[PDB]
């Protein structure tokens with residue numbers, strides 16, 4: 001099976017999370033393509049992939065709390081080929097904030113409005129992902145089992 005992983009990361013936490021998930025999928029036999037959201041084009045982005053995993057950090061704001069590199073993709077999510085696609089979301093944040101990992105909720109809700117099939121509840125990481133490595137691996141393991 002082929003999996004696409006797209007992440008938006010400012011300090012490297014969601015990027016570390018994306019690379020950890022990519023290894024667990026590859027070691028289970030999937031062909032994995034991992035890309036920074038700053039370098040992708042939304043048009044037909046998901047065409048040909050069996051599983052798509054989307055990740056991003058949360059930054060408090062009055063208009064949009066998504067990490068800046070992911071905004072352009074999010075705004076054009078309707079042109080990616082999400083209808084009927086198997087997808088799951090993940091993201092890093094901090095529970096001292098009101099909207100803890102709020103970007104994960106925003107992405108799940110829009111994918112749901114576009115007809116995607118959310119395979120598993122989103123992974124929400126508090127603090128340093130390097131200390132939550134077991135939670136990342138287990139989630140990756142559970143997403144493989146819903147495919």
Ligand SMILES: Cc1cc2nc3c(=O)[nH]c(=O)nc-3n(C[C@H](O)[C@H](O)[C@H](O)COP(=O)(O)O)c2cc1C
Pocket residue numbers: 008009010011012013014015056057058059060061065067092093094095097098099100101102127
């Ligand atoms: C100014 C600022 C605002 C932040 N706002 C939020 C927030 O609204 N919700 C949240 O869960 N985390 C918030 N964080 C925590 C970051 O999302 C967290 O540090 C995360 O690990 C960053 O991930 P990244 O390196 O992949 O960009 C904020 C951090 C800073 C510095």
